[PDB]
Amino acid sequence: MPQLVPFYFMNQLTYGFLLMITLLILFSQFFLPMILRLYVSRLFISKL
Amino acid sequence: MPQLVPFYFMNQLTYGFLLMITLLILFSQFFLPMILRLYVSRLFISKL
Amino acid sequence: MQLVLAAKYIGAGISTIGLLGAGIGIAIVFAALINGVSRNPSIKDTVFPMAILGFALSEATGLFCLMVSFLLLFG
Amino acid sequence: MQLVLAAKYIGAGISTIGLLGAGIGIAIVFAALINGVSRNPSIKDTVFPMAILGFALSEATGLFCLMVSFLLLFG
Amino acid sequence: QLVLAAKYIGAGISTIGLLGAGIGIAIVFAALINGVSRNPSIKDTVFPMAILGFALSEATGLFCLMVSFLLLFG
Amino acid sequence: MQLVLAAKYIGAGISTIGLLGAGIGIAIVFAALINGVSRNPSIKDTVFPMAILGFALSEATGLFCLMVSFLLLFG
Amino acid sequence: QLVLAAKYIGAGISTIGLLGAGIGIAIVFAALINGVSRNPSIKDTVFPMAILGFALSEATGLFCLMVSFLLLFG
C-alpha cells in the first residue's frame, strides 16, 4: 500500500520510541505513584 | 554564467541587506563615536 | 500491463473469502460465552477476559487475510 | 483498460462470499441467546448486551468484506 | 510476464486456508469457556492446554500465510 | 548544436579586444600623473584622488567588455 | 537556428566600441591632471567640465553596450 511505505520510517519510529521512553519514565516515576499515594492515604485514614 | 545565477538570490540579498542595516546602525551609533570620543578627549587634554 | 493489474484485482478479490472463517469464529466464541453465563451466573467475571481474548485472538486470522488483500489492492 | 475493468467486476463478485460468515454468525449468537434465555429467564439484562456486542463484532467482519467489493466496483 | 501476474492469483488463493484457523481458535476457546462454566475449579489446570491448542492451530493456519508470502515476495 | 557553442566561443574571443582600450587608458592616466607630479612637486596630494578616480573609472569600460565575454563564455 | 548563433557574433563584435571610451576617459582625466598641475587654482573651476566630458564619453561608449545587450537579449 502506497501510504504506509514512505521515506518517513525513521521519523515515525524516532518520535514513537521517544514517546515510549518518555511515557515509560513519566508514568512510572510520576503518575502511577501519585495514584498510589491516594491509595495509601485513604487506607491510612481508614486504619487510623 | 552558471554559478552566479542560482535560486539563492533572495538568500544573498537578505543576509546582505541585514548586514548593511546592521553595520549602518552598528557603525553609526557605536564605533565611529568611540573614535570621536578619543578625538575630543585628546583635544580637551590638549587645550586643558 | 493490463494483465498484471487484472490478476492483481482478482487475487485481491479471492483473498477476502477468509473472513467467513472469522465471522463464524466470533460467533462461536460469543455463543459459548452466552451458554456459559446462562448456565452459571457467577462465572461472568472470570470467563469474560477469556471471551475477549478468544474473540480478538481469533479475528486476527481473518485480518491477516485482509492484509494480504490490502497488499494486493494497493501494493 | 477494458480487461482491468472487467476484472474489477469479477473481484467485486468474489468479495461477496465473505458475507455468509456474518449470515451464519449473527444467527449463532442469537440462537445461543434464545437457548440461554430458555434455560434461565432471569439473566436477560446480563446476557443480552453480550449478544448485541457479538452481533456488532461479527457484522464488522461482514462489512470488512463488503468494503472490498465497494472498492472494486468504483474505486 | 504472465508469471508476475499469476503469482498474485496464487497469493490470493493460498490465503483461503485461514478459514480453518479462525473457526479453530473459536472451537478451542468455546470448549474452554464451556469447561470453565461447568467446572469452575479447572481454569488453572486446563488453560495451558487451551493456549497450546491455540498455538498449534494458528501455526497450522500460518502455513498458508507463509506460502502466500513466498508466492508474493519470492 | 555545435554551431551555437562554436559561434558562442568565437564571439567570446571577439569581445576581449576592448581591453586594449583600457590598457592604453590606465597608461595615459598614470602618464599624466607622472608628468604632473614631476613639474609640480606639491600637487601630489591634490592630484592623486583624481588619478585613482580616472584610473578605475576608465577601466570600467574594459571590464564591461570582459563581462560581455563572460556572459558569452559561461552563459 | 543560425540566427541564435549569429546574434552572439554580433554581440561580440558590437562590444569593440568601448575601445574608444576607455581611451577617451583617459584623455579627459589626463588633460584634467595637466591643467591642475600647471594652474593649481583651477580645480574647482574646471572639474565639472571634466565630469561632464566623462559622462558624455561614457554614454557614447555605452551605445555599443546597449546594442550588444539588445543583440544578446532581444
Add this chain to the structure above:
Amino acid sequence: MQLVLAAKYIGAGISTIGLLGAGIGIAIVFAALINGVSRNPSIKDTVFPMAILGFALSEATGLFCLMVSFLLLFG
C-alpha cells in the same frame, strides 16, 4: 565536436590582440617616467612607485585578456 574545438582555437587566437594595449601601455608609463626624471631628478623616490603601480595596473588588463585565451585553449 570538431567544430567547437576548431572554434576554440580561433577564439584563443582572437583573444591575443588585447595584449597590444599593455604593450603600448607599460611603455607610455615608463616613457613618462623618463621624461619626468629628466625634468626633475630629485623627485625619483616619489614618482617611481607610481610608475610601478601603473605598470601593475596595466599588466592586469593584459593578463585579463591572456586568461580568456588560456580558457579557450584548454578549459
Add this chain to the structure above:
Amino acid sequence: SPLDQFEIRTLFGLQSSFIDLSCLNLTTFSLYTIIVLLVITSLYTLTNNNNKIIGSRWLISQEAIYDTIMNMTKGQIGGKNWGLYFPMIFTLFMFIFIANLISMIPYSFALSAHLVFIISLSIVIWLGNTILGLYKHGWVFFSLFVPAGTPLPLVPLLVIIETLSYFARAISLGLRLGSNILAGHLLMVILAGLTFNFMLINLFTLVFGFVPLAMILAIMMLEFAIGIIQGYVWAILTASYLKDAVYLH
C-alpha cells in the same frame, strides 16, 4: 483514493548537507505524538484538583483504568514479582487507548494505523521477551518449546511448529492492531464517500436519505468498541507473553 487520510506531511522542517538530520522534524505523525503526550499529561496533572484526597469525578476514569489493568496483570503473570512489569503493561495500554480516541475525531489522523511503527513496537516487545528469557533462564529457556508430557517420537515436529508459532508472535501482535484500526477507518471513509454521491442525485434521495446516515452512525458507534477492545487485547497478549518468557510454562 479513499486512503488519502493517512498522508504524512512535513510541517516545521529541518535539513542540512553535513548530516542527515531529516530523521527528527515536526511532522503530522510527530505533532499527533505531541498531542497524545499532552493529553496523557492532561489526564493526570490538572485532573487532580489541588492534590485532594477525595479524587474528583475526572479522577474516577484514571482510577478505573489503573484498577482494571492492575487486576488484569495480576491474573496473568501473577508470580513472586508481577509489579515490576506493571508500568510497561500500563503504558502500552494508554498510548493505544488515547491514540484510538483521538483518531475518531473527524478531521484527524490515526497513529495506530501505521504498520511500520506498530510492527516495530511488536518486534521490540518480542526481542525484549527473548533476551529477558535467555538472561533469566540460561540454556533451559528452550524448555518452553516442549509442551508437557508428550511421546518422544513426535517431539521434534512439536518443537518445529512450536518455534514457528513462537516467531510468528513477533509480527502477529502488531498486525492485529494495525489491521483493525486501518480497516475501521477505511470502512468509514468509503461509506461516507458512497453516501455523499448517493445524496447528490435527484432531490427524492435527500428525502429518506436518513437511513444510510443512520448506518454510518451505527458504524461509528461500533468503531469506538473496536478501538478500545484492541487497546485491551494488546495489553492482555503482552501480559501472557511475559508469563511465558519469565516463567517457564
Add this chain to the structure above:
Amino acid sequence: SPLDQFEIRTLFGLQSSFIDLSCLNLTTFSLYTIIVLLVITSLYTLTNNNNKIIGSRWLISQEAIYDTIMNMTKGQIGGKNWGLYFPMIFTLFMFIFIANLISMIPYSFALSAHLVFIISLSIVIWLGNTILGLYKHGWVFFSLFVPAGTPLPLVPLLVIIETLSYFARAISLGLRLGSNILAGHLLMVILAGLTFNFMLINLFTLVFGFVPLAMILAIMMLEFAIGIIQGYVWAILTASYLKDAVYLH
C-alpha cells in the same frame, strides 16, 4: 571548470511546507557575512585596550581608515551638511575592504564576486539618490540634466544622452567592482591550474619551475592592490553621486 570556487552550498538548513522560509538559512554566503560582521566587530571592540586614550598600535589602522574617509568625503560633498552622510560612506567602504581581504585567504570565498548582490546594492544606492534628490528639490531636480550655459538648439540631445548616462549609473557602479573581483580570482585560479599541470610532466620541469611560481606570487601581490583600490573607488563614486543628488551641480 575553474569557476567552482564560487559555489554556494547550504549548511544549516531550514524548510517548511506552509511558508517559503528558505530565504533565510545559514549558507556559505551567509556564513561569510557572519564572519565579515565578526571581523569588523573585532577591529574595534577588543582592539581598544580597556578604553585607553593613547590608542594602541592596532587602533592606528582604524584611525587611518577613518581619517582617510573623512578627508575624502569632506572634499566631495563638502557643503553645509556633509557629515550627515558619513556613516553610509564609511560602511560602504569597510564591507568591501574586509570582504576583499577575507577572499584572498586561499580556501575561502568572495562575497564581492556575486553580481546579484553587488548590482542590487548599486541599484539601492541609485534609487536612494533619485528619491532623495526629488524629495529635497522638487520639480527642479531635473535641472541636473542640463550642464551649463549651452546653446538651446542642441539642449534636448544633451538631455537625452545625459539621462542615459544617469541611469547607466545604476549598474555601472556595481558591475565595476564585480568585474574586478571576479576577473582577479578567476585569473589566479586559472594560472594555478596551468602551473600545476606544468609541474607534473617529466622531472626536469620541477627544476627551474620556480619562475611560474614567482609569476603567481607577483599576481597575488597585484591582487591586494586591485582589491583595496576598488574598495576606495566605490566610496569615491558614491560620494560624487551624493554631491550631484544633494546639490544641483
Add this chain to the structure above:
Amino acid sequence: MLKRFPTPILKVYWPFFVAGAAVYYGMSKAADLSSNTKEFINDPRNPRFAKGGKFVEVD
C-alpha cells in the same frame, strides 16, 4: 564597554531604506520568474518541491 550614542539614522537615510524595500520586492518577483525556466525547473533544491508540487518535467 561601549556607550550607545543616539545618532539620527532614520530622519537621514529613509530613501535608502525605501529603495531597499523596492529592490527587495522586485528581486523577489525576478527570482520567482527565473526559478521556473527550462534550465532550472529540475534542480531539486528549489523551494517548489518543499511545498506540494512535483516534477512538471515536460520540456
Add this chain to the structure above:
Amino acid sequence: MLKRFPTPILKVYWPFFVAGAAVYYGMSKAADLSSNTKEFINDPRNPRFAKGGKFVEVD
C-alpha cells in the same frame, strides 16, 4: 505539584531498550535499502537531494 519517586526503570527494562536499539538500527538499514528502489528514487523529498547527488533518473 508532583513529587518524583525514584522507581527502578533501568535494572528491570534493559532488554526492551537493547531490542529498541537493535530494531532502530535494523530499520535504519531497511529504510536506506528501500529509499533507493525504482519507484522511489525520484521522489524529491528523500534526504539524498539535501546532500550532494542529483537525479540518477535512468530506469
